């Protein structure tokens, strides 16, 4: 169906332990496909998915240069941020960036993204119109003025509407065997007595891809949101994800509870119950 490509940058200063480390990871949906680490023995963009390995030698040289240039650019950005925030050179700071595009089934651009953060807080972001910016504070407004003066939004827009969607389109074709295959969750409900008055019903979702999924418990047909323990979706390590939702129910009332699962790999939402 819909797909996304996203690149994530992390630049971290470490005074007294060398120059700031720069890392870049690229994803198509929930699949990591390329990585770059400035701390590597011979830093370069490296393939992390089978379908990207066929890209030509020029691809890898261009991609690697982009990252090496970025290593220097972001070290500069870190020095600039210190000035913008009147901070000393003794602390460790982090700049993060995430940018990319989302495309619909027809492969046409749905939305473009470009956002930056400093020490975990929003710094600046390209608005959805791909022509204006939103600065979080007076320091970011300084960068905004610079980027507006240099027509940066216009250059990003060109990229987001062209190369971004064009490359994503190619990757989806080359990796269609996996990128375009949704693996439905394998589901089951477990029963764990807590006391003599209440028991724990845990609804499991295993081996699914992509990560997006919805697990909910209902009591007599009513959602138990405020009464459901839901763990964060986690990676299994084989490309798939796992997740569970649990509710504490009075002994003898387990049949009044039903688990509901929604995943794009399911032609229809599923309803589960404790099967004693």
């Amino acid at each position: 169906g819909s797909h996304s490509m996203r690149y994530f940058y992390t630049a971290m200063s470490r005074p007294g332990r060398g120059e700031p480390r720069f890392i870049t990871v690229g994803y198509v949906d929930d699949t990591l496909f390329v990585r770059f680490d400035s701390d590597a023995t011979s830093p370069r963009k490296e393939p992390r998915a089978p379908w990207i390995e066929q890209e030509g030698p020029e691809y890898w040289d261009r991609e690697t240069q982009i990252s090496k240039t970025n290593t220097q650019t972001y070290r500069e950005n870190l020095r600039t941020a210190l000035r913008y925030y009147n901070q000393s050179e003794a602390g460790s700071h982090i700049i993060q960036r995430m940018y990319g595009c989302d495309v619909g089934p027809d492969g046409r651009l749905l939305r473009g993204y470009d956002q930056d953060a400093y020490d975990g807080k929003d710094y600046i972001a390209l608005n959805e119109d791909l022509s204006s910016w939103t600065a979080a504070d007076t320091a970011a407004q300084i960068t905004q003025r610079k980027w507006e003066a240099a027509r940066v939004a216009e250059q990003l827009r060109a990229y987001l509407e062209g190369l971004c969607v064009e490359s994503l389109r190619r990757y989806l074709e080359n990796g269609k065997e996996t990128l375009q295959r949704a693996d439905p969750p394998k589901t089951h409900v477990t029963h764990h007595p807590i006391s003599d008055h209440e028991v724990t019903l845990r609804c499991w979702a295993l081996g699914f891809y992509p990560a997006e999924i919805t697990l909910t418990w209902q009591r007599d047909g009513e959602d138990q949101t405020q009464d459901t323990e839901l763990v964060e979706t986690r990676p299994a390590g084989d490309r798939t994800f796992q997740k569970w939702a649990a509710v504490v129910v009075p002994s003898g009332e387990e049949q009044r509870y039903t688990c509901h699962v929604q995943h794009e790999g399911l032609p229809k939402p599923l309803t589960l119950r404790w099967e004693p």
């Binding site: 691809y59 991609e63 982009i66 240039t69 950005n77 600039t80 240099a150 250059q155």
Partner: peptide, 9 residues
Amino acid sequence: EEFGRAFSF
């Protein structure tokens, strides 16, 4: 493929 242009803060 990444955007090949960099712009400083």
